Design a protein around this ligand. Sequence first.
Ligand code: HEM
Length: 464
Amino acid sequence: HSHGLFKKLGIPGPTPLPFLGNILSYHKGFCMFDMECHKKYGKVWGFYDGQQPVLAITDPDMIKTVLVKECYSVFTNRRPFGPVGFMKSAISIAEDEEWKRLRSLLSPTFTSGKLKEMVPIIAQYGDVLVRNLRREAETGKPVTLKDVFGAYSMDVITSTSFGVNIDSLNNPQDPFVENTKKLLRFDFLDPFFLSITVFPFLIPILEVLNICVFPREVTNFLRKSVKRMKESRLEDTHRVDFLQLMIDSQNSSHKALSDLELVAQSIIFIFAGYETTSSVLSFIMYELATHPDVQQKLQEEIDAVLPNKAPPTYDTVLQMEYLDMVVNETLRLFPIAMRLERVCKKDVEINGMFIPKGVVVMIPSYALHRDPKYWTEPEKFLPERFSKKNKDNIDPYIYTPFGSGPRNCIGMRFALMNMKLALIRVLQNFSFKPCKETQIPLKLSLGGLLQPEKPVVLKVESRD
Ligand code: HEM
């Protein structure tokens, strides 16, 4: 038991119970716990996830020192998450140079020039979402944002990973959908993951038993699909899509994306860009619906830059600001990641405090984003916060929805754009208003994922 590392170092935090540590404080969730700790221990506090020392930091200087300055040196890797298998080669799970290699191979794929060429396909499904959303609205019943924005998200990373173009909302059985739909996020407060962190000696046992957190049935299916797709369709001789950009690169520093690595990167891109988007999109619509003044002002801004339901364009989106403000403000209130984690690879000292080796440095994003010491009425949805004549009053190391430094969200530009394209056409064709079932105020889940307690159902009316 390392339970006492923190007070020997003079770092405050909750009293750890043997073996369990401080996991029984996650009964409320990662978010509530972090904020209770932040108020009851000030800037720095240390807790034990089983027997893993976790040190929380809230100093913009120290966050920059961890996320940016000493990234490649000390704070490169994230914490091991469980039996991963071949998916160990996915950028998100990769560690040290092996990561640094992959990052460089993929850095181009997520360039504005590539994104701008992908807009046509993303916008195509903007219409598919609208046409789909139309029906349910006219039908005269409340709409499950979870389902429609889920189908939109799905039709995206799927379609920008080769031309398997699908209306998942109308094809709930397309195997390709059936499999990819299981690529949801991990509730790390689920008995299993909780059991794994108290008993990390089990991860090796599960690995030789060929048990993997990523459902094999899905992993294999794609591992076959990607291979058939990489040959059967495009070695007759291409479409602008992550896969193609990955196949194009393979055949021209460290390079040579292993056929299996390519699959792993593809799988992690839907894992990182499926429920993430579907969740944020729904959160925005709730905030817009609950604040009609914002929804109109946004609907107006769109109609101005795009006269008469004018097709959304790349350059056009960059212009729209109030939209960027609404998106950025919804992210402040709902940082889906909740926490930004880096492992201390060696014994180091940063701006004063000393960090032992093998300690997980945690940036409580949710807590920072809602810290009254940086935010006026933090529980208020005030887009104005992110005005051109205010943003310079926002520390980038406090507002970290996509993280920061060399290991930030590589698909940040894509995710923002992808959400913007939808919101624009969605608001262009419809208006969202509180329903009888609409839960106000919105109650967040006590689990290990930043989701609503009850699914967001709202009334959709087609303005003319
Ligand atoms: C609203 C949408 C999204 C949000 C809020 C989001 C947020 C995040 C955050 C907070 C991280 C961790 C950054 C850190 O540790 O400092 C991350 C990592 C990552 N995200 Fe996203 N993300 C989003 C969408 C996407 C999409 C669409 C993709 C890919 C298509 C993607 C790919 C990744 C990858 C690969 C990483 C790991 C990067 C690395 O290890 O170098 N994300 N994301």
